[PDB]
Amino acid sequence: MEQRITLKDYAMRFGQTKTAKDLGVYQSAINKAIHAGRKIFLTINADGSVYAEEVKDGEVKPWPS
Amino acid sequence: MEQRITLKDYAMRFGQTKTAKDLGVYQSAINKAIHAGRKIFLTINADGSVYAEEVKDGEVKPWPS
Numbered sequence: 001m002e003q004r005i006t007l008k009d010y011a012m013r014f015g016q017t018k019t020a021k022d023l024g025v026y027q028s029a030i031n032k033a034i035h036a037g038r039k040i041f042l043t044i045n046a047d048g049s050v051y052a053e054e055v056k057d058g059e060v061k062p063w064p065s
Numbered sequence: 066m067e068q069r070i071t072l073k074d075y076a077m078r079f080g081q082t083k084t085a086k087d088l089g090v091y092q093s094a095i096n097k098a099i100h101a102g103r104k105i106f107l108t109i110n111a112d113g114s115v116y117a118e119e120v121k122d123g124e125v126k127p128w129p130s
Contacts, residue, residue, distance in 0.1 A: 015078075
């Protein structure tokens, strides 16, 4: 089954540094997106590969950009 | 003028590694205090100095000892 977890929750457990590492963006970007309240969720793969998406403008898109 | 923040939150933004460095301590230590729910909080000074204190045994003391 696919497993999803919000960006906030992921950050919460792993901290924003590790999160930044997993997703491959800057910590400033994640703190930014958490503060903004963006609707970002990560889906987790068994290989340990992680990716994020965002619900924005009536659709589900990748995050970032 | 005093700005405080929980070790938890602090570590969450910066990660236990830089936290450890900031307070001068073992990352393992951060780790355990956090898992243990110790009432540790940090105060931030404008020059960039960071210090930790703990509420325990009815007083506010430094951390660690």
